[PDB]
């Protein structure tokens, strides 16, 4: 909650209109000049240490992407910094929970952004 | 509410990923396929019987519609049937608060949805 507002707040800085879904919907809602971005925050860690989202909470949010063309991540609060995970990085497990390995790592805000920026750029050209 | 559930499910069982604004961003921001529209719910009439949208109000979806690159309509409930006007198409009074003229009676949910996938084409194609 805390790390999500500084998040929104953030995007909104960064030019994005921002909408938090209401009390499955992704948590984060950005967009910008046409770009959608859909970012989960830190869902959460399982018995080996391992981020996890849950089957039906990440089979809603990856239905709420694929319907809106929207790209998603999980959004991952370090203490240190905070790291987004593009959602097909994920793996599926056996139980069709879906878990962050480790190599991963994500984009920091600004690479995040980034790939926001050159699709409008290519969107523009 | 009434209004914005039931426009909130036909969008959803025409294709369309939704959110509602919590509790000043569009009332629905609907999402199709990279398509961004944003609705805002039948805001209201004045001594004239004209439909308006209040200036902050008006002033914070427009912001939003430009920011994200969505298409913002205003959706006006009638006791007959429900018309949607892009927002571009409503007056800005000589107080900055912003009215739907008569005449317009804007798109219904078919033609939006049509505007909607027409843009996908496009894209696609």
Redesign the interface.
Known sequence: SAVERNIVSRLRDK???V?????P?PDI?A??????ILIEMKSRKDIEGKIYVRREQAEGII???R????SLFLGVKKPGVLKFIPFEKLRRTETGNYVADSEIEGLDLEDLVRLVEAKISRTLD
């Open positions: 030019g994005f209109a909408v938090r879904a209401p009390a919907i809602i967009l910008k000049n046409g770009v959608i239905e709420f992407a319907k809106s063309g929207g």
